[PDB]
Design a binder for this molecule. Structure first.
Ligand SMILES: CC(C)C(=O)c1ccc(OCc2ccc(-c3ccc(S(=O)(=O)N[C@@H](C(=O)O)C(C)C)cc3)cc2)cc1
Ligand SMILES: [Ca+2]
Ligand SMILES: [Ca+2]
Ligand SMILES: [Ca+2]
Ligand SMILES: [Zn+2]
Length: 291
């Protein structure tokens, strides 16, 4: 029997998150975590994993700069101070994730969206992730980052090529770059095998207890909590509205912006959030306008 697992999570938001989101931050973080939690409940992962928020902190803490490698190391040694000796104590957490509006930047480019060391979930000193918040898509960056935390590699790594098969495209969470993920199958057979093996070898021992009193994650669709306009505001800023699009609805969110004193449209190529209205009795699901 495949034992159910609970990831008791500390959600930390920073200096820059608070300025951007203001009063709307706590609700926003929960919407994001609700989505991350949903990716992990998908049968593709072939394991029962409940991503549960037990503590949420809004910020004197970690050093947050452009270097992603540096910000991660800082947050990981900081987080450790908020932890507790035993997992009996309702204040203990199994994983820590920081969210920042800071443009996190790797060794070559700034396209980096987050960072985590691989296979650390039950090491309270290493169980760590940082995420660059560029709107609701950050839920996806989070799911990916926790993927790493759960010992998964990218889908183009040598071991994955073998398990994924010669026909595997980049439509999965553990793609090396941001990808449109298969709603029918978010996790590659590689991802499922790596987490499976990771848990069967006892590296998830800290995940067996059920959380004392978890924060209440919303049940609604992200595209209902936040309409197209709010989603544009979340990615590009408060003055940004949805750009009316000719019909490929749901596939890509296009937003307004201002360059030289006239309007223009802008995109990070991310889909409209799940549940966003796209017609009379229709909403976006996985990049498609369904009934
Ligand atoms: C809708 C449902 C299926 C779901 O909730 C869902 C879940 C996840 C998802 O997105 C997939 C996804 C998300 C993020 C990434 C991704 C890709 C690259 C990077 S990165 O920062 O450039 N690389 C870092 C990394 O590999 O983690 C390096 C720098 C350490 C960071 C994140 C790659 C794929 C999309 C949807
Ligand atoms: Ca506990
Ligand atoms: Ca970046
Ligand atoms: Ca636990
Ligand atoms: Zn990665």
């Amino acid at each position: 029997a495949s034992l159910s697992r609970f990831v008791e999570t500390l959600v930390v938001a920073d200096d820059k998150m608070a300025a951007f989101h203001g009063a709307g931050l706590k609700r926003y973080l929960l919407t994001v975590m609700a989505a991350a939690a949903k990716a992990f409940k998908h049968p593709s992962i072939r394991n029962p994993v409940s991503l549960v928020v037990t503590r949420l902190v809004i910020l004197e803490g970690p050093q947050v700069g452009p270097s992603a490698a540096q910000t991660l190391r800082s947050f990981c040694a900081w987080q450790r101070g908020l932890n507790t000796p035993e997992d009996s104590d309702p204040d203990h957490f199994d994983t820590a994730i920081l969210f920042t509006r800071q443009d996190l930047c790797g060794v070559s480019t700034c396209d980096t969206l987050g960072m985590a060391d691989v296979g650390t979930v039950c090491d309270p000193a290493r169980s760590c992730a940082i995420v660059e918040d560029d709107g609701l898509q950050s839920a996806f960056t989070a799911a990916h980052q926790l993927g790493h935390v759960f010992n998964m590699l990218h889908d183009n790594s040598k071991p994955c090529i073998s398990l994924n098969g010669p026909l595997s495209t980049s439509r999965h969470v553990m793609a090396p770059v941001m990808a449109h993920v298969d709603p029918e199958e978010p996790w590659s057979p590689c991802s499922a095998r790596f987490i499976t093996d990771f848990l069967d070898n006892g590296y998830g021992h800290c995940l067996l207890d059920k959380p004392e009193a978890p924060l209440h994650l919303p049940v609604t669709f992200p595209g209902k909590d936040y309409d197209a306009d709010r989603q544009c505001q979340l990615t590009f800023g408060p003055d940004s509205r949805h750009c009316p699009q000719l019909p490929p609805p749901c596939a890509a969110l296009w937003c307004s912006g201002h360059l030289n004193g006239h309007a223009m449209c802008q995109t990070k190529h991310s889909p409209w959030a799940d549940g966003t209205p796209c017609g009379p009795a229709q909403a976006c699901m996985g990049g498609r306008c369904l009934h």
